Amino acid sequence: MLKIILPSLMLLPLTWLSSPKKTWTNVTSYSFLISLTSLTLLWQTDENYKNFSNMFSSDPLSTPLIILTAWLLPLMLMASQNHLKKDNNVLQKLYISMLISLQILLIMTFSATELIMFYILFEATLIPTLIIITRWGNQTERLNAGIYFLFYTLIGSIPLLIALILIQNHVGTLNLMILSFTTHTLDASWSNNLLWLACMMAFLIKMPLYGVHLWLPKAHVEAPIAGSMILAAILLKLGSYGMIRISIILDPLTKYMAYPFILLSLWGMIMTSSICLRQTDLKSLIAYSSVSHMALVIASIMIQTPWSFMGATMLMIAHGLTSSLLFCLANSNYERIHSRTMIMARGLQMVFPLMATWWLMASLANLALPPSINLMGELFITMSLFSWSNFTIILMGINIIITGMYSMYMIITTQRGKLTNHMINLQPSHTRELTLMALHMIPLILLTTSPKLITGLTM
Amino acid sequence: GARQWQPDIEWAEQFSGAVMYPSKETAHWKPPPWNDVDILKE
Amino acid sequence: MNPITLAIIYFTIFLGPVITMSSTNLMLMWVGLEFSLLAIIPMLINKKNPRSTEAATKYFVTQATASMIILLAIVLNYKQLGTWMFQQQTNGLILNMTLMALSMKLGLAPFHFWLPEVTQGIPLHMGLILLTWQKIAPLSILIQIYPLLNSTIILMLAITSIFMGAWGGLNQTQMRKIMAYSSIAHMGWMLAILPYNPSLTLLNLMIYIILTAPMFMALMLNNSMTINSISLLWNKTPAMLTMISLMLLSLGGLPPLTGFLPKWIIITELMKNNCLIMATLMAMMALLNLFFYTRLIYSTSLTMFPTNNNSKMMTHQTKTKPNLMFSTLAIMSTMTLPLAPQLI
Amino acid sequence: FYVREPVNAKPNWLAVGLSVGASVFMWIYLIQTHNEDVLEYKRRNGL
Amino acid sequence: LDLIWLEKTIPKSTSTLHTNMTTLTTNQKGLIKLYFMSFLINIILIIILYSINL
Amino acid sequence: MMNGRPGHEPLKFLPDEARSLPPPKLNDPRLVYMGLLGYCTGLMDNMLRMRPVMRAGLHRQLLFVTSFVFAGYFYLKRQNYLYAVKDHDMFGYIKLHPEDFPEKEKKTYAEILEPFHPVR
Amino acid sequence: MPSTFFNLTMAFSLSLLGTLMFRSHLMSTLLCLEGMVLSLFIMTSVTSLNSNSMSSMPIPITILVFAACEAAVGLALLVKVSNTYGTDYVQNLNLLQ
Amino acid sequence: QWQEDPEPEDENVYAKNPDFHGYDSDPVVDVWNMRAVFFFGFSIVLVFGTTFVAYVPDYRMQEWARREAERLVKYREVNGLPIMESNYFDPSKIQLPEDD
Amino acid sequence: RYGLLAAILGDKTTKKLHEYSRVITVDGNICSGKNKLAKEIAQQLGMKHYPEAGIQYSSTTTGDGRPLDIEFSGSCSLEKFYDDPKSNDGNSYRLQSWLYASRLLQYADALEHLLSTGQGVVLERSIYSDFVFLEAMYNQGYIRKQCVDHYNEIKRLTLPEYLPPHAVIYIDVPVPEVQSRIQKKGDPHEMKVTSAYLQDIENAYKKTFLPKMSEMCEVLVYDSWEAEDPTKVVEDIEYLKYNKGPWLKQDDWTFHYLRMLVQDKTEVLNYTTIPVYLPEITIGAHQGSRIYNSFRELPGRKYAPGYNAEVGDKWIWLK
Amino acid sequence: LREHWVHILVPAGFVFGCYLDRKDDEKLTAFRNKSMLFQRELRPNEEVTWK
Numbered sequence A: 001m002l003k004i005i006l007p008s009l010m011l012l013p014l015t016w017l018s019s020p021k022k023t024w025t026n027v028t029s030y031s032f033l034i035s036l037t038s039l040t041l042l043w044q045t046d047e048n049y050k051n052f053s054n055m056f057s058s059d060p061l062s063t064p065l066i067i068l069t070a071w072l073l074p075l076m077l078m079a080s081q082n083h084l085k086k087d088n089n090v091l092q093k094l095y096i097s098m099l100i101s102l103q104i105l106l107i108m109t110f111s112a113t114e115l116i117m118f119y120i121l122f123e124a125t126l127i128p129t130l131i132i133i134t135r136w137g138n139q140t141e142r143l144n145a146g147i148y149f150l151f152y153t154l155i156g157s158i159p160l161l162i163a164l165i166l167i168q169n170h171v172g173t174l175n176l177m178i179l180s181f182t183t184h185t186l187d188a189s190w191s192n193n194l195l196w197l198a199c200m201m202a203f204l205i206k207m208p209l210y211g212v213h214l215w216l217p218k219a220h221v222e223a224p225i226a227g228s229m230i231l232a233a234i235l236l237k238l239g240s241y242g243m244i245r246i247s248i249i250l251d252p253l254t255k256y257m258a259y260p261f262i263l264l265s266l267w268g269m270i271m272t273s274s275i276c277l278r279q280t281d282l283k284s285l286i287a288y289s290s291v292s293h294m295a296l297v298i299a300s301i302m303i304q305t306p307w308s309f310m311g312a313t314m315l316m317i318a319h320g321l322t323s324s325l326l327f328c329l330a331n332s333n334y335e336r337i338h339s340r341t342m343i344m345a346r347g348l349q350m351v352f353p354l355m356a357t358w359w360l361m362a363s364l365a366n367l368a369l370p371p372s373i374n375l376m377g378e379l380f381i382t383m384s385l386f387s388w389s390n391f392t393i394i395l396m397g398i399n400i401i402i403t404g405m406y407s408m409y410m411i412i413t414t415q416r417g418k419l420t421n422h423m424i425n426l427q428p429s430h431t432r433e434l435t436l437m438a439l440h441m442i443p444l445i446l447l448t449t450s451p452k453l454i455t456g457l458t459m
Numbered sequence B: 001g002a003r004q005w006q007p008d009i010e011w012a013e014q015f016s017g018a019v020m021y022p023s024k025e026t027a028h029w030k031p032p033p034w035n036d037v038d039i040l041k042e
Numbered sequence C: 001m002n003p004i005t006l007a008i009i010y011f012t013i014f015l016g017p018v019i020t021m022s023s024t025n026l027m028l029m030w031v032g033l034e035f036s037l038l039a040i041i042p043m044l045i046n047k048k049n050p051r052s053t054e055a056a057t058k059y060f061v062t063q064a065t066a067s068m069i070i071l072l073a074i075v076l077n078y079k080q081l082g083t084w085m086f087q088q089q090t091n092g093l094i095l096n097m098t099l100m101a102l103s104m105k106l107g108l109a110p111f112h113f114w115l116p117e118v119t120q121g122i123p124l125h126m127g128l129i130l131l132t133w134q135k136i137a138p139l140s141i142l143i144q145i146y147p148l149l150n151s152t153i154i155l156m157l158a159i160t161s162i163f164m165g166a167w168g169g170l171n172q173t174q175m176r177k178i179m180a181y182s183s184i185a186h187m188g189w190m191l192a193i194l195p196y197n198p199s200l201t202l203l204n205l206m207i208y209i210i211l212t213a214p215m216f217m218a219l220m221l222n223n224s225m226t227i228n229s230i231s232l233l234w235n236k237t238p239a240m241l242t243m244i245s246l247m248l249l250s251l252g253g254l255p256p257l258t259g260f261l262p263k264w265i266i267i268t269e270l271m272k273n274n275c276l277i278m279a280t281l282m283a284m285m286a287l288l289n290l291f292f293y294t295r296l297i298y299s300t301s302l303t304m305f306p307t308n309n310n311s312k313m314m315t316h317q318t319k320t321k322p323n324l325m326f327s328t329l330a331i332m333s334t335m336t337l338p339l340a341p342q343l344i
Numbered sequence D: 001f002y003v004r005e006p007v008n009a010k011p012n013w014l015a016v017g018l019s020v021g022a023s024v025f026m027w028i029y030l031i032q033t034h035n036e037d038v039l040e041y042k043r044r045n046g047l
Numbered sequence E: 001l002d003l004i005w006l007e008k009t010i011p012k013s014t015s016t017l018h019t020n021m022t023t024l025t026t027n028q029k030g031l032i033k034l035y036f037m038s039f040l041i042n043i044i045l046i047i048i049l050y051s052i053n054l
Numbered sequence F: 001m002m003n004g005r006p007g008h009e010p011l012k013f014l015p016d017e018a019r020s021l022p023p024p025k026l027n028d029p030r031l032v033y034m035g036l037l038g039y040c041t042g043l044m045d046n047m048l049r050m051r052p053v054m055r056a057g058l059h060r061q062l063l064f065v066t067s068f069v070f071a072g073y074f075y076l077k078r079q080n081y082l083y084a085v086k087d088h089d090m091f092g093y094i095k096l097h098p099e100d101f102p103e104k105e106k107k108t109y110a111e112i113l114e115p116f117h118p119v120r
Numbered sequence G: 001m002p003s004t005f006f007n008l009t010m011a012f013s014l015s016l017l018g019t020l021m022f023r024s025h026l027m028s029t030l031l032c033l034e035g036m037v038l039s040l041f042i043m044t045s046v047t048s049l050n051s052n053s054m055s056s057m058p059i060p061i062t063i064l065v066f067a068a069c070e071a072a073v074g075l076a077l078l079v080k081v082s083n084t085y086g087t088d089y090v091q092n093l094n095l096l097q
Numbered sequence H: 001q002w003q004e005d006p007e008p009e010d011e012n013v014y015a016k017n018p019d020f021h022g023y024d025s026d027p028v029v030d031v032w033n034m035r036a037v038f039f040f041g042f043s044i045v046l047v048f049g050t051t052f053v054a055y056v057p058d059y060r061m062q063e064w065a066r067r068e069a070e071r072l073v074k075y076r077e078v079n080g081l082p083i084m085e086s087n088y089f090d091p092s093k094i095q096l097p098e099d100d
Numbered sequence I: 001r002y003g004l005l006a007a008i009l010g011d012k013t014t015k016k017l018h019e020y021s022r023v024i025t026v027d028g029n030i031c032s033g034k035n036k037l038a039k040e041i042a043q044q045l046g047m048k049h050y051p052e053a054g055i056q057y058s059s060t061t062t063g064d065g066r067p068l069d070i071e072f073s074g075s076c077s078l079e080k081f082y083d084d085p086k087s088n089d090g091n092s093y094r095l096q097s098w099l100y101a102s103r104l105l106q107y108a109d110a111l112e113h114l115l116s117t118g119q120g121v122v123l124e125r126s127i128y129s130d131f132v133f134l135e136a137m138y139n140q141g142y143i144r145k146q147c148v149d150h151y152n153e154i155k156r157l158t159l160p161e162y163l164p165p166h167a168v169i170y171i172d173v174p175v176p177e178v179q180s181r182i183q184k185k186g187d188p189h190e191m192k193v194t195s196a197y198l199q200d201i202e203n204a205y206k207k208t209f210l211p212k213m214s215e216m217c218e219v220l221v222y223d224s225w226e227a228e229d230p231t232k233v234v235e236d237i238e239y240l241k242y243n244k245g246p247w248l249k250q251d252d253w254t255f256h257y258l259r260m261l262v263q264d265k266t267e268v269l270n271y272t273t274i275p276v277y278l279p280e281i282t283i284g285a286h287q288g289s290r291i292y293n294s295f296r297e298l299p300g301r302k303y304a305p306g307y308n309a310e311v312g313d314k315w316i317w318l319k
Numbered sequence J: 001l002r003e004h005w006v007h008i009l010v011p012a013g014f015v016f017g018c019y020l021d022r023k024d025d026e027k028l029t030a031f032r033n034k035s036m037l038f039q040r041e042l043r044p045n046e047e048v049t050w051k
C-alpha cells in the first residue's frame, strides 16, 4: 500500500510547487484520483488478509477506513476553500499540506501491522490536528481546546507506550499477525487487570467515553470545519480501530474487566444524547451526538460478539460520513449567519431550498431510518447488547427515543419555522457547498446498497 | 468577515512578570531588567 | 578580550573536558574537571553586570565544593586500594560520594538550584556552553564508572530531577531559566539509564545537545530572554517560527519527531530491566514538560502576540543571519526518527 | 540597487568552487568506495 | 454532571494539583545559604539511604 | 556493552572486519532519506536566511544533499557492522553456553489444553 | 594511621559542614574551602608516605597547585563582589531569584 | 488604545461574478475549479469506482461458499453423512488430558 | 563582514583615527539654522555630515532608499504631531519613539563610518539630545507619565553601549526669535506651535543636556551670532582639546566589539523593540501582520539584499 | 515537460509506488510456491507460479 501513500506524499510537493491561483484544483483533483487508487484494496476475492509487505497491511477492518481517509481529504480541501481563502498564499499551502499529512499519517495508522507503528503514527496525528485547530481556530478559546485535545490523548498515550513495550518483552514482537496466531492469554492478576486498562484507556480516550469526552465538545466547537470533519470522521475512529486490534491479546480479562466501561458508555449514551436536546450551539449538539453514537461503539467493541464488531464497523464508517455531513452544513450556516447559535437562522428552507434536503437526509442518517447502514449498525449492536443482558434494551431504548428528538429538532429549529427577519442577508448557496454535501451523501447511498464491504473482520 | 481571535494586549500581559503562576508573595517579584543590568548603587 | 586570552581560556574550557574523557588515572580526570571550573568563570562575567558576579560566585562555590568532594573520593580510594581509580571492590560509600558530587557539577535533582540561577545571569551564548559542553565532562566520569554505582540513588536523583525540572519549568517565563530547567530534566533521564545501559546515556545526551544548541541560537538570533520577546518572533524573523515549534515539541517527547527516541529506548531498556515502576512515573511527568513547551509554542507560533511599532524598523534592516549550524542541527534533530535503528 | 549595497550581489566564486568541487570529490570517493567495497566483500567472502 | 462535576474532577483538578505544586517548589528566596543547606540535607539522607540498605 | 570485546579497536571507526559485510547499496532507502533530510536542511537554510527557497544556493543545495549522503554510506556502513557484531557475539554465546539456551519441544495443540473462556 | 586517618577525614567533613552552612562573609567560606584542600593534601601525602608509593607523590602537590589557582579564581570573584556591593556578605547575592 | 484594523466585511462575491461557484473570486479559476471537481469528484470516482467495486468478484469468498455448501450438502445428504457433524476437529486427533 | 579574523589580521580602528576624527553633534531648538553649521563644519574637516534623523531615514538607509509609505515607516507624522497635540491615537509618542530608533540607526551608522573609514562624524541632534523633545512633551499634555518611562527604559537599555559624542555644539537662539524664524519658513504645521512648548525644549537642554554632557564631552555653546559663522565655530572645535570623556579608554581590542555592534543594525535597535506593551507603541497582530506581509512584498525586500530578482539581482542560483 | 512538471508529480508517485510494491514481492518470495495449499508442480515452460 504505497500508492495510497506515496502518491499522497507527493501531494505535498504539489501544494507547495504549484501556482497560488491553481494550488487548490491540483490538490483536490489529484486526491480524488488518490481515492480511486485506494478503491483497489477493496478487491479481496478471498478471506486471507492482504499483507502488502512487512510493515504495511490491510484487512477487512482497515480497508473500509483507508478509503474513507483518502476520500475526505478531497472533501476537506473543498470545505475549507472559503475560510482560508482570506489567507496570504503561504498560510493556505500550509493548511492544505496539514490536511494532506493527516490522511498520509491516518492511511498508514489504519494500514499498519506493528502496533507501536500504530502508536507513533497514532499520536503523531495530534500534531497536524492541533495546528489545524489552534492556528486557524476562530474563537478565543482554541488555545484551551488545543491543550485539552493534547493532554487527554497524551496522558492516555504514555500508558499504552509502556504496555506495548511490555507485551513485546512478554511475547517478543508487536506484529499484529503473529500476536494473533500466538498464545497471549492474560492471567487475571491484579497487574494484568492494569495492563488491560493501560492498552484500552488510550483508545477509549480519543473514542470519547462518558468519563473523558469533554475534550471532543470543546475541540470541535472552535476547530475550523476541516479539523471538525477530520476529528469526527477519522480521528475518533482511530480509537475504535485500536480497540479492535489490541484486544486480540488481553483475551481473558475483558470478559470481566469491561463492565465498568460498558455501563459508563450505555448510561453515557443516554446523558450525552439528552444534553444534545437543549444545547444552543449547533456544532455543540453534533459533537455530543458524536459522543453518544460513539458510546455505542465502545459498547460493542467490548461485548465482543461477531455482530457487535461489524455493527461497530458499519456504524463507524456510516456515522463518520453522516457526522461530517452535519458538521459541513453547520459550517455553511455559520459562515452566512456568523454565529453558531441554533435559535437564530430559523426558516432557512424558505431561502435555501436544497441545503434543506441535504439537512433532512443527514438528520435521517443521524437517527436510524431503516434502508441506511446507520440503522443496520445500531440494529446489530442493539442485538448483541440485548444478548449480553436483555435489560440493555431499556438504556439503548431511551437513547433511540432521544436520538430521534434531537436529530429532528436540529431540522425543526434550523431548517423550518418562520424566516429570521433580517440577519445579514443570506447569500445563495455556492455549488461547492452543495457538492461537498453531495460528495458525503452519494457515498452513503451507494454503501447502503451493498453493506458487505464495511461489515468488519467478524463477518 | 472573520478574525480568528489573535491575542490582545491583556492575553499577553500574563506572560510578563518573573513567574507565570504568581504566588501571594512571589507576586511581588518583578521582571528582571531586559538589559541584564540592575539599577542598585550606593 | 585580548584575543590571546580568549584563546587560552577557550583552550582550557576545551582541554578541560577532553583531559577528563581521555585519562584513566582518576586524578587526571579530577584536574580535567578543575580546569573546566577555572576556564568557565572568566567568560561567565564578560558583561560584568551586577547579576553576573552573582552568577559566577555561585557557580564557582557550587563547582568548587563538589570538586573537593570528588577529590576526597579519589583520596579515599587510594587507601582502600592502592590504585588511583575506582574498582569492583570500592567501598559503596566511596562511589556514592562520587555520584552526589558529580550530580552537583551536572546539577541533578536536589542540587538543581545553582543551574537555573547561573543560567539566568549568563549570556545566551555562554549559557549553551554552561549547559552542554560542561555536562560532557562529568558524565564521562560517571559513564566510565557505571558498572559500580548504585541503582537506587541514581534512580532517585533521576526521578527527582525529572520532577523538579518539570515543575520548575511550568512557572518560569524567562527563557534562559526554562532551558535550565529542561536541562535538569533531560539530565535526569540520562542518569536513569546509566546503571543499566550507558550507551543510551550517550544518545540521550547527543540528542539533547542537537536539540538545545539549535534552540538557544534561536533564542539569541533575536536575543529574546522573555517568552513575550520570542513571541514577536513572527515579526522579527518569520521562518524560524516553524522549526522553533518542532524543536521545542521535539525537546519534549512527542512521537513523530527525533525527541521520542531517547525517551522510547530509555523506557524500553528500563522495562527490559524491569523498572516498570520508575519508568512509568518518569514518562508521566515527562508529559508535564511538554505542557510548558506547548505554552511557549502558543505564544511564539500558534497565536500571534501584539508587537511594538519600532519592530517595523528592525525588519527594514537586513537581519544578520543564523549560522548554518542552526539548519543542520535543526533538521537532524527535528526529523531523524525514521533512522532510529542505526542511531542506537 | 541599494543605498547600502548587498555584500552578496556578485557571487563569492570561491564559495561556489569549494562547494561544487567539494561535492564532486565526495561522490567520486563515495562511488569509488562502493564498487571497491563490493569487491572486497565478494573476494573476502565466497563471491 | 457535565461542565462542573466532570470538569472539576478530572480536567480541572489535575490543573490545580500541579499549579499549586509548582507554586511551593518554585517560590525560592534565591539566597545561597538556604539553597546550600538543602544540599546538606541531601547529603545526609543519601548517606542514610546507603547506611540503612547497607 | 559491546565495548571490552576481545580485539576491540580502541579508537577506530569501522574495523576492517567490517569488510566482510556487504556494502550498503547507495540507494538504500536510508541513504536516500539522508539525502532528502539534507535537501531539506538546505532549503530550510535558504528560508531562514530569506533567500528564494528553491532557486538559490543551487551549489549549496548540492553540498547538502551530497554531504549528508556521503556521511550516510560511511555511517551506515558502520552501524551495519555494529549490528553484525552483535549477532556474532550473541549467536556464539548461545552455543558456547548451550545448556542455558536449550531447545524446547512445543506440544502440538492436540496435546496442550489452553482453557476456553466463552464469550456468550 | 588508621586512627589518624579518621581525624583528617572528619576534619574534611567538619570543613564540609562549614562550606555548606554559610554565615555572612564569603571570605569565610573560601577560607573553609581551603581547609578541605589542606585535609585532602595531608591525607594523600600520609597514605602515599606509609604505602612507600613514591610514584604517587606527584599527586599530593598537583592537588595543591590546582587548588591554589582554584582559590585565586575564588578570591577574584570575591574582590569583584565587594567592588559591586562593597560588603562581601553572601546576603546580597540574590538578584538572580 | 493600541492600533489594530477595523473589522473587514465579507464581500458579496455574488455581486460581481454573478456565476460564482464558491471556489475562488476570479471567474475562470472558479469555472476550472468546478469543471475539474464535479468531474474527478462525481464523474470518475462515484461512477468508475462504483463500477469497479460492484465487479469485485466473490468478495471475501461468500460467492464461493454458497456453492461449496451446495456440493457438500449434495455430497453429505446423498452419502447419508450428517450435514453438519457435531464435532469439527475429529475426536481421534485430540489427545484429551487422560487423567482428568 | 568585519570579524575577529579581520581584527587579528590588521584592520584596527586605532591606526585609522586622526585629530579630525571625532563624533560631533550640533543641537539646537526647532530652528537653529543648525543644518548649515553642520554641513559647514563638515565641509571644513571633510567630516561625513549626517542629516537629521527622519521618519523614512531608515528606508533611505535600507535597500532601494526610496521613501517608504507612512504605515511601512511606523505611521508617524511630525505634521500631525503639531496640528493634533495630545491626539487620541498618540501619533506624537509614536513619532518620538520612531525618531529615537532613527537616530539610534544614524548614530550607529555614524560610529561604523568612524571606526572603519576613520572620517569624523557630524550628525546634528543626537540620541542624548532627543530627550528634550519628550521632556517638553510631558511638561505639557502631549505625553503621559508612563509614555515617558517607556522612552527612558529604551534609552537606558540602548544608549549606554554607544560611546558619547566627543564634543557637542549648542546653537541657541531665544524662545521668541525661533518662533519668528518659524513664522517665515513656509510649512504651516511648524507654525502655531506652543511658545511654552518651545520654552520647555530649550529649557530642558539648558537645565539637563548641556550640564550633563559637560563632563562626558566638550560642550561648545554658541550664540546665534557666533553661529552663521561656521568658520569661527569650526575654528573653536579645532581648538578644543579632546581629553575629558569615556573615549580615552577605547583600546583597539575594545573598539572591535563596539564596531561589531554597530556593524549589526538588528542589534543596535534590539532593545528598541522590547516587549513592553504601552498602547501607542503596539502594532497589534492583525494590523502588524498585514503591514509586515505588505512591507516584505515590496520589490527587493522579499528576499535578502542580493537575492531578489525584481530589482535586477542576478546569480541567485549560485549565491 | 514544461509548466506540466507539477502535474506529473503525483502521477509519478504512483508509478514509483507500484515499482516498490512489486519489488516488495520480489523480497518476500520464499515459500514462493512452497506453500501447502498452493504447492502445484511447475507447469511446462513457466518459470515460477506467482511473480
Ligand SMILES: CCCCCCCCCCCCCCCCCC(=O)OC[C@H](COP(=O)(O)OCCN)OC(=O)CCCCCCCCCCCCCCCCC
Binding pocket: A088, A090, A091, A094, A097, A098, A101, A104, A105, A124, A127, A128, A131, A135, C238, C239, C241, C242, C245, C246, C256, C301, C302, F047, I293
Ligand atoms: C509527522 C507529521 C508531523 C507534523 C507535520 C505537519 C506540521 C508541520 C509543522 C508545522 C509547525 C508550525 C505550525 C505553525 C506555522 C506558522 C507558519 C506561519 O505563520 O507562516 C509564516 C512562515 C514563514 O514565512 P515565510 O516562508 O518567510 O514567508 C511568508 C511570510 N508571511 O511560513 C512558513 O513557515 C512556511 C513553511 C512552513 C513549513 C512547511 C511544512 C509543511 C508541512 C510538513 C508536513 C510533513 C508531513 C510528513 C508526513 C510523514 C509521514 C511518515
Ligand SMILES: Nc1ncnc2c1ncn2[C@@H]1O[C@H](COP(=O)(O)OP(=O)(O)O)[C@@H](O)[C@H]1O
Binding pocket: I029, I030, I031, I032, I033, I034, I035, I036, I052, I078, I081, I095, I096, I099, I124, I130, I133, I134, I190
Ligand atoms: N524628538 C522629536 N520630536 C518632535 N519633533 C522633532 C524631534 N526631533 C526633531 N524634530 C523636528 O525637527 C524640526 C527641526 O528641524 P530643522 O531645524 O527644520 O532641520 P534643519 O536642520 O534642516 O533646519 C522641528 O520642527 C521638530 O519638530
